[PDB]
Design a protein around this ligand. Structure first.
Ligand code: PLP
Ligand code: PLP
Ligand code: NA
Ligand code: NA
Lengths: 403, 401
């Protein structure tokens, strides 16, 4: 039997996180507990009012197929949110609800990118952006950023990398993995560059929108001059509302593009969960920015961020870019590369450093090479201050003998 | 402006009928709706309670991409106890419904230019999923006089070295036909001559089956295990369509590839739905009495419809033995003229006539690759069906003149 696979599924890169995940299990399966800082999800429960709506949907028998694009009441609520929070005007037929925002993103990429098109992706990047480009038979063009610039795209670098083939720029703000927030003035410079190239669209991943630390503010890319008709706005419920397991995300965009994504979704999964969609309606019903329910999570995230930064920031050889959003610190420990650790061996890149932290000191983190930047390691602070204080002590002890 | 691949996708043809139906209903005009592809029954109470408990207990975080271990294990047990198949948990991939399971299988194994063999009448998405893999759908018509089952000679005549996937849906949507084991064996003997040819076995209607008909998993046949992608799920048997939970079982190498694809498509399925799925499998072999009650209702409805519609002059019916659809040949009526409507000459016009003039909504067979028929769903109560048969009788009466 011929077991050959399609070239596209073969083009998918190997996991750079697998080894951490596997070693953590291995360590636990022995006698060794592990501090987990690798997860890309909130540690909080889904808000009570949201869970209530989900339970209610089940009891009321709202358990049948929905419209492919999503239930009307949810798409209407999304339009109100985009208007109230982001100043954007969309009609319900410009919204597509999917099983999480990852699906919204994939479908956008597959709908707009033709083979050979180039997809511009600033690094450090969310792992899936490059792979989704590949599934479109498109070419990722990665643009590295610098920690001293808070990992923000340099517009001059963008201009340098544009070609006739450039089709899509993917912008994540607030960012996974850096927690950086793009300021409006920089977005306006980027937008002026995009406006000069008719073929160039922008995929704006805004999933962390409400996980933001005042006075930092979120600017939707679609609100910039002349950018509405070339922007695919992606957002959802996983991060702001601790609804990762529910699987609910969405895309708002130009009708011609949204129709194409909707057609694709009709072959991929049909409508998102009827139950999850009712919960999403309730989440949006919490009012602007999720109201006090979300504000409490954000206050906790801020305490955690502030503690982590002050704690790790005073370790020799550590560089930090202060995040203004999300719940990740993308930390430069590269000064330690070249070190030899007893009972482990050479630490000379993000992967070996992360594996050293876990194998020898029981703290699981994600190496920066997973995000296209080997100079750093991603730490998630979606865990309690108690876990964070414990992790900080382990990290200190781990770096101590490396000098 | 848009990728050629998304461009290549055909839109539905079914939205017209279903939208007009909804409109009429919201207008104070009662429509008997027989167009749905989902059970009338609620999700079973024990299963619904499990999803509710999952929510209350905080099982609302991301699962393993492939699915929670508990569920993949339970799926392995089901495949053994119900289908006689042995799979390991790393040979199972849980997705957001079986439609996603199917799409990922197609994308994983088909290279550009490969052929996907799809017997008609087919479920609508199969041809579109093939296009998404840059593969060529090769449709093989079946005949109502063969119970809409593949003639092995027709399969043989269409096989090439490019033939990469054969899609076998049994019990079938839209025909209700069940592949007998002896026929599956003949097909397997033909497949064995072609090393490139894999089989995608869509077994979602497995438990919706009418004794003495039985379900044979394709992967159970001699030498077929290593070349079969077994797809099944929860939507149909357990009335869980809105929950979004399905799965693939197959050779580890292929399932691993599907899992990698899924990592870029959607990540893991709903944590809540997966907990409900565990409870559904916990109802016992074939869904226990819970599913048995549904099947009993379905059978009564099938028997009634087949007897009633079969009595009508110019109506041809096959021998449905599963699912909850009748794919009815009204083609003898094409060319007729209806007052206040005009010419009826294809399945689309006939469906529109049935709906506009007689308030019964059904799906034109053209949607499934066979314009000679109309699909009627009997996922509705017997009393409603009795009313629908009466309307259909009255709708066809003046067309015979
Ligand atoms: C979590 C995340 C998303 C959305 O995830 P879903 O759970 O699929 O909604 C999108 N972008 C980034 C960078 C994320 O981290
Ligand atoms: C309903 C159905 C499926 C599965 O649908 P999901 O709800 O996506 O699980 C698969 N094949 C056929 C023919 C169906 O009718
Ligand atoms: Na805002
Ligand atoms: Na069986």
């Amino acid at each position: 039997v011929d077991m050959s696979l399609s070239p596209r599924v073969q083009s998918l890169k190997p996991s750079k996180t697998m080894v951490i995940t596997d070693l953590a299990a291995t360590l636990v399966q022995s006698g060794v507990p592990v501090i987990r800082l690798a997860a890309g999800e909130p540690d909080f429960d889904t808000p009570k009012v949201v869970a209530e709506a989900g339970i209610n949907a089940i009891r009321e028998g709202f358990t049948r197929y929905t419209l492919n694009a999503g239930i009307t009441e949810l798409r209407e609520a999304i339009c109100r949110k985009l208007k109230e929070e982001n100043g954007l005007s969309y009609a319900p037929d410009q919204i597509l609800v999917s099983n999480g925002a990852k699906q919204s993103l994939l479908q956008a990429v597959l709908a707009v990118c033709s083979p050979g098109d180039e997809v511009i992706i600033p690094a450090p990047y969310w792992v899936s952006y490059t792979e989704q480009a590949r599934l479109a038979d498109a070419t990722p063009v990665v643009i590295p950023t610098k920690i001293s610039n808070n990992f923000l795209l340099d517009p001059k670098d963008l201009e340098s990398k544009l070609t006739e083939k450039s089709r899509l720029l993917i912008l994540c703000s607030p960012s996974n993995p850096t927690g950086s927030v793009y300021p409006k003035s920089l977005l306006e410079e980027i937008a002026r560059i995009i406006a000069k190239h008719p073929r160039l669209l922008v995929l704006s991943d805004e999933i962390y929108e409400h996980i933001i630390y005042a006075p930092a503010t979120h600017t939707s890319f679609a609100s910039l001059p002349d950018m509405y008709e070339r922007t695919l706005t992606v957002n959802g419920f996983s991060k702001a509302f601790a609804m990762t397991g529910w699987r609910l995300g969405y895309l708002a965009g130009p009708k011609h593009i949204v129709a194409a994504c909707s057609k694709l979704q009709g072959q991929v999964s049909s409508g998102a969960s009827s139950i999850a969609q009712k919960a999403g309606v309730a989440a949006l019903g919490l009012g602007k920015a999720g109201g006090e329910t979300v504000a409490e999570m954000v206050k906790a995230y801020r305490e955690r961020r502030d503690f982590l930064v002050k704690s790790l920031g005073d370790i020799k050889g550590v560089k930090i870019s202060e995040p203004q959003g999300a719940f990740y610190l993308f930390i430069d420990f590269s000064a330690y590369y070249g070190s030899e650790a007893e009972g482990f061996g050479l630490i000379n890149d993000s992967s070996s450093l992360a594996l050293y932290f876990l194998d020898k000191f029981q703290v699981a983190m994600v190496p920066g090479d997973a995000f296209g930047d080997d100079s750093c390691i991603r730490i998630s602070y979606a865990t309690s201050l108690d876990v964070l204080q414990a992790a900080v002590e382990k990290i200190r002890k781990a770096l101590e003998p490396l000098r």
